[PDB]
């Protein structure tokens, strides 16, 4: 298969995390597979089929915690792959598959809108924030509180190994939002005095379990213990289909560089081995909410968002499988 | 008046982390009154008596949460200030600072080494080990543990903002340990395959409360939530009488630029606040055993040290005041 | 504009508390709306619609927190404006609006009766229960499981600070049920004889989440600590709609005359304030069932019953509005 | 009136625990009925109809607390009886009974074999996982795990009174499954290198509460303790629609004889009570999830198991009844 | 015997509780002795040995839950026991009573001052305190804590049956410490925004719990629930000795019309019962600190404070006694 | 190296379970001493002292996780060594052993009435009370409390494998106590009627911990999820000196065939193991007193019956030792 440049530029980049958050990996995902379609040089439908399956495969084996890659991916490709069997003609497989792939990118763009207007009423005026990692859903509802007139304060986690509250804390600072950045360590120390806890999600589970970025499960096992509101501002995208019939999630291990640099680490005795979990799975009793585009859920309330919206395709092979 | 240079050297690599870990503070305090007594250039005891105050003043005014320090600086001039008022001649005085900066040196290093010899008890053959910081008390007890041939692996958290951990890690690999290092935020992730925690301790409170290195707190709540073990080794001379008759411990609030470096702190906007809380209090719930000298205490205990060891002198005010 | 007096009694009674209790409170305003409508003097529609805005204007304007008052509103809102805005003439739109408010004043009386019926089969022969503030669909409950030859007993809580209690002794009492009247710090006390807990709600949110009379939340708090199952007896007009897109609930902040009264309370200095919420808000995790007319719910999920029944009229503003 | 000798003694044996287990119970039920119509003398529908109303009580009237009986009983009399006042013939009548008992009996199987698939996928190389009783959903889930090459172990807890795990240890064994076999009062002891429990069901309500074997609770709780999942497989027929309407399930008091051999409680004094309840109720806060033959859900969805497949029954009386 | 006026005159008082607050009770217990020792008119030593015994008695039965009185009691008759029983004539015992009388209530205040002082070390600046009852103990830590300077908010609970809040309110309003006056209902509700909880003790025992007025461990667990710590305020002599050899102590019942007044209650029906416990019992789990006059302990440490002050007069009866 | 018949006798029936119980143990072992010395023919002292030696091995050897046992033998040895050490001719260092043995044996009988005398005080008029094992202290409890006509019932867990609860609900019965049997499994089932457990044990650590007969940890876990305090009977010699110098108690692992007979367990597969643990260890958490026969305390308290009672013999080796 003729593959364009851009579908291999976009994997190097979910790998690499130059490309990162689960909501814009999976719109990325979606404009690879829109460029592929742009550009291919394919004569016939079935050519192109197999272009656009093979693109699939590419960005379905980048990064594997987040389903919201591949829930864009199976939003783009259930569409291209019942034209190609009804016989579309080969224009019509091409703007099947362009027009999904826009399809999902405004509808996430909008669903993190709604999002922030959802979540920011249940922030109120005063309120310190602790949130974690970097989230634009999380931050949608930060923000759209702050555009409110609600006096707010937001506690930026580091997040390590790499860093992501940095950019979560100048993203905030820069809409005037007064921050407080701490290391990871400091979450229960500064416990007391937060009012609510704003996070995001890569996969939410079946059961009401929540993956995000690792040292999640402590900020939020710590809120409960002080009884502070942990609310998990995430996407019908960020729910994991596989979960309804068993599967567990992998948690991505990614490489040991990114906690102790190269230089030093191979300095270091061989008896030390560098464990780098990317993400951590909270239970679903220690959030207060998932904020949903379609709304408030308590967590154990993801069997339905899935069963309504997923449950379906779990009978059919994955859209760009043989 | 004439303090000589050592005293002035040890205060600022107290206060700058050259020197640090509650007990090398101690000992190195113990040390800088040791050389101003020897070099001391008086020919009455006012004038070293003077000295001895002095020099104590400037020793304590560096770093406040841990009590090892005052507490070592107290074993020395207790017995300076006892000698003085009895009329002790310039020598006598001289003797009694030097024998008594020794002792409790001495002592130091001899609990230390015991304190390993009983926590090594209660440590099994195959477990998996977590820690936190880098504390000479706690390494004693993994230390002796592996001496005495069983095979443990510990899990070495991070530590930041500092790193300690890397400190932690190379010197448990350095006896044959293996180790795991992590991020702070995977101590939860990590805790279902670890089967005890041991760390130290800054300052132990009459209530049995565990002030120690920022992150502690997490450690050990969610030990608690996960029933491992959570065993704090520490010295006597951590224990904290002011506590006795209700003193909450300082909590030391330490330069932002050990969080973010100068270079890229100051290009960041003013209303971002960096906080760098250097301890956080772990409640006495969360604790099973702290591990002394004098052997396993449950950590309500923590009264009973601090009467027999500490309370007389808390009708008499600092052996170093005016 | 032409408002009839039993609308501005309705309102200055469910004000003073004169009439008080979700249901009841609901159905005076359904009610209140009926009068409305048989008496209005308007000769066109538009003339009849507008009074029926302004009535229901008046009506939402008295108390806050208790969802049921603004959903029986709705009940009868959201059929005269269908009604209205399809072309209704005068006697069609006043026998909608008074048919309407007959229906649900029917079936608030039907769901009490049917909560009863089920809830009485979760009391057990020989049962201590505990209950707070007066709720009908609480003591429908209690009343059936009595009818049934079932020998309970029934601990009242006074319920400050409008001793609430006392009503529901007396009225207990007096279906042959005996009871034990406890001042509210009592509950802890007595919750280790108690078997059931018993409740209502104001309102029910989005994630399960129980409003109730002040205090419910400390008696669900100990209820839990003890084991002892608590158990919601709520209508579906409980349920709170707003909350699936993020809304907070109201808490009332009422007279402080009704804690401390007026005689009593001017001779109080300028630095005491009397505070007076009449509603606390209980977690999910605290409650056992909800017991509505449709049945037996976990708390959780509230959500469904929010989806199906309510949230529909989400995407348009209220049936009263301009 | 004309009750075929198959009948009678599947009622015996299932008295007297000869056939046990709630599926294989059900199984067991449905059998029966089929053969009373396969070996039925009536000549009119009528008589029939008869006949299995009848069959259908003597066989609800042997064993209360597993649902899974009565809804074998209803999947059978549901059809039987909507056939019946059609105004089917003889023959129609005869296969409806014959054709849906064998529907219900063979998706029970086929039930069994998908929750194990299912749960399968929640096992993980390495696991040890505890079990209670003799579930055959709970020994598909291991199988199935370990036909898929994963080494686990399964701690087999023994069962009193009935000394069921010696058949859930043997079996086991026979695949080829290490088993570690202990008495019930160690399930603490061994939950901290437990990293999974897998249990049956015999009864689940509309809030999440699972009916099971004597001890399932305090394996539940102690799990709960530890942080392991607990993981109940069931079948949809497990699920108890009487709770929708707030029955409470009873629990099953069967012989002291089985707890105390007939010889020696003779001997024993009249002042020694031995009571022997065959099941306890887990609650669902302690339940990770329900692995069903339609999937993965959290405890708290239950009800929709229930709303969606036997909600339709509960307005009508049951088939059996006249 | 030949008791005064003023000794009947108190214990009338104590009943009525027109004099109440476990120190103030003991003080004027102790009061009482000293009159009768002062006033009477024996002539020989066992006379007034006599009196003092009878004296002793009455006081004693007057009001059991607060172990002060009693502690009191002994404190002065253990000493006018020994005087009498080694021969000391009139006048020597006429003084030991007074004597030991004034050393009781001097002592007292004392103790007052300096638990008020060492508790307030544990206030800082800002905080929001919230109290249960009066006691003069919690109000000495909160009146030290505001002349320090420390911009303090107290949270009054109302306290029915008594209505005990108000005085704390009148009273910390008047030292021009803001206060907060809610009903004990409210106690949840306001856990949010409180710092620190501070109350009375009327009776500490061996193994750390806290009787206290009824709505004490209410407050305490939802101060848990928070980790708002919870610190009792109380004199050595509120601990109670004979729980060390295993006694429960009494909680006394009050008499049902200082709940619904007289007027009222005898209209009420007969099956309608009124409870009122003056008391309940905190578990020691539920507080961070007792501030004894002799300084912080954990609540498990008040069996040392008995070993050492109390232990000893267990082995003989009580000093009144023949 | 002579040895008398008795001591191997002893050694055998403590190795059996045929002696049984931690008192009864330690009553056996200093019994078998005192009668190695009675009839020894031993010349010399250091011939005498020899067989006392060698005897305290043979029995120290039987079983290790009761320390009862050892502090029996150290209590006889300590005494005999220090006699032979001072030169203590023969007939001299006989009645040492003679008389210390007998010594222990009476105390051992009056710790265990007065711990009855202690803990029956604590029992009510009306309660329930489970138990486990066969504890002689925890009975004295039961048998007290009811000899003071309190009408009580006792809870008799049957305590798997060896059948202890047999023998205590026979025992309880004998006295007139009605008694309750059911299986370990039920413990959690009917610990909602139980007021009340009352447990021994056979070694109590430096931090509170309780190791008692298997399942002991259950029971206490389920009374603390429900509330019900729960009180260990034990002796002083209960509590184990090794602890507080770090040494964690062995967990005898008993015979295989305990729980499965020898004829039934030849016949099963070679893959099933049959694990045996005789005790656990409940955390003191789950604890509310010790009640010993000095007095009631707080579990964190079992450090002072140690420091006090045991602390001086750590310096030293074991009696018994060369
Ligand atoms: N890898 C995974 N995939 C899916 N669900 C998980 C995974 N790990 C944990 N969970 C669920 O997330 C929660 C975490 O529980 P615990 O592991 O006990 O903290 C539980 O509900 C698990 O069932
Ligand atoms: N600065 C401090 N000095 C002494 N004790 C403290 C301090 N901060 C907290 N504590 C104690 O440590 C524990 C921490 O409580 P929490 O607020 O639950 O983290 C409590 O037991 C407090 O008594
Ligand atoms: N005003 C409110 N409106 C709606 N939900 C609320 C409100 N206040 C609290 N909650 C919810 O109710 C629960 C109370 O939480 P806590 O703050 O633990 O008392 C949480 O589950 C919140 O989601
Ligand atoms: O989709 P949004 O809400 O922006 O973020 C969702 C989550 O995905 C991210 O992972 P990574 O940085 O790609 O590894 C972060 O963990 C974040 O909370
Ligand atoms: O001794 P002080 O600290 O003042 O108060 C101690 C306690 O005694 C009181 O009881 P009551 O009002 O006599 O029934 C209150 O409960 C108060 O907390
Ligand atoms: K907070
Ligand atoms: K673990
Ligand atoms: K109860
Ligand atoms: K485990
Ligand atoms: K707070
Ligand atoms: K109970």
Same mark, same amino acid.
Request: without cysteine; glycine residues 4%; hydrophobic residues 45%.
């Given at each position: 298969?003729?593959?364009?440049?851009?579908?291999?530029?976009?994997?190097?980049?979910?790998?690499?995390?130059?490309?990162?958050?689960?909501?814009?990996?999976?719109?990325?995902?979606?404009?690879?597979?829109?460029?592929?379609?742009?550009?291919?040089?394919?004569?016939?439908?079935?050519?192109?089929?197999?272009?656009?399956?093979?693109?699939?495969?590419?960005?379905?084996?980048?990064?594997?915690?987040?389903?919201?890659?591949?829930?864009?991916?199976?939003?783009?490709?259930?569409?291209?792959?019942?034209?190609?069997?009804?016989?579309?003609?080969?224009?019509?497989?091409?703007?099947?598959?362009?027009?999904?792939?826009? +399809?999902?990118?405004?509808?996430? &763009?909008?669903?993190? @809108?709604?999002?922030?207007?959802?979540?920011? %009423?249940? #922030? =109120?005026?005063?309120?310190?924030?602790?949130?974690?990692?970097?989230?634009?859903?999380?931050?949608?509802?930060?923000?759209?509180?702050?555009?409110?007139?609600?006096?707010?304060?937001?506690?930026?986690?580091?997040?390590?190994?790499?860093?992501?509250?940095?950019?979560?804390?100048?993203?905030?600072?820069?809409?005037?939002?007064?921050?407080?950045?701490?290391?990871?360590?400091?979450?229960?120390?500064?416990?007391?005095?937060?009012?609510?806890?704003?996070?995001?999600?890569?996969?939410?589970?079946?059961?009401?379990?929540?993956?995000?970025?690792?040292?999640?499960?402590?900020?939020?096992?710590?809120?409960?213990?002080?009884?502070?509101?942990?609310?998990?501002?995430?996407?019908?995208?960020?729910?994991?289909?596989?979960?309804?019939?068993?599967?567990?999630?992998?948690? +991505?291990?990614?490489?040991?560089? &990114?906690?102790?640099? @190269?230089?030093?680490?191979?300095?270091?005795? %061989?008896? #030390? =081995?560098?464990?780098?979990?990317?993400?951590?799975?909270?239970?679903?009793?220690?959030?207060?909410?998932?904020?949903?585009?379609?709304?408030?859920?308590?967590?154990?309330?993801?069997?339905?968002?899935?069963?309504?919206?997923?449950?379906?395709?779990?009978?059919?092979?994955?859209?760009?499988?043989?």
């Amino acid at each position: 298969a003729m593959i364009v440049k851009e579908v291999y530029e976009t994997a190097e980049k979910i790998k690499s995390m130059e490309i990162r958050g689960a909501g814009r990996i999976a719109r990325a995902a979606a404009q690879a597979l829109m460029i592929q379609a742009e550009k291919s040089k394919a004569k016939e439908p079935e050519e192109l089929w197999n272009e656009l399956k093979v693109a699939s495969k590419i960005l379905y084996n980048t990064r594997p915690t987040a389903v919201s890659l591949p829930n864009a991916l199976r939003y783009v490709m259930h569409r291209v792959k019942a034209a190609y069997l009804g016989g579309a003609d080969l224009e019509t497989l091409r703007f099947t598959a362009i027009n999904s792939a826009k +399809e999902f990118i405004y509808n996430s &763009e909008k669903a993190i @809108e709604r999002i922030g207007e959802i979540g920011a %009423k249940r #922030i =109120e005026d005063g309120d310190i924030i602790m949130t974690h990692s970097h989230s634009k859903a999380a931050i949608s509802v930060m923000k759209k509180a702050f555009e409110q007139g609600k006096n707010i304060k937001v506690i930026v986690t580091e997040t390590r190994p790499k860093w992501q509250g940095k950019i979560t804390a100048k993203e905030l600072a820069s809409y005037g939002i007064p921050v407080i950045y701490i290391v990871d360590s400091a979450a229960r120390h500064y416990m007391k005095m937060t009012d609510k806890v704003v996070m995001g999600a890569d996969s939410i589970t079946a059961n009401g379990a929540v993956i995000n970025k690792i040292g999640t499960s402590l900020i939020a096992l710590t809120a409960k213990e002080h009884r502070v509101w942990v609310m998990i501002a995430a996407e019908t995208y960020k729910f994991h289909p596989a979960t309804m019939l068993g599967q567990l999630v992998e948690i +991505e291990m990614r490489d040991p560089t &990114e906690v102790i640099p @190269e230089e030093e680490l191979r300095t270091w005795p %061989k008896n #030390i =081995e560098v464990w780098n979990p990317a993400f951590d799975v909270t239970p679903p009793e220690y959030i207060d909410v998932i904020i949903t585009e379609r709304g408030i859920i308590p967590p154990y309330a993801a069997i339905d968002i899935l069963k309504e919206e997923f449950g379906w395709a779990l009978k059919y092979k994955e859209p760009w499988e043989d």
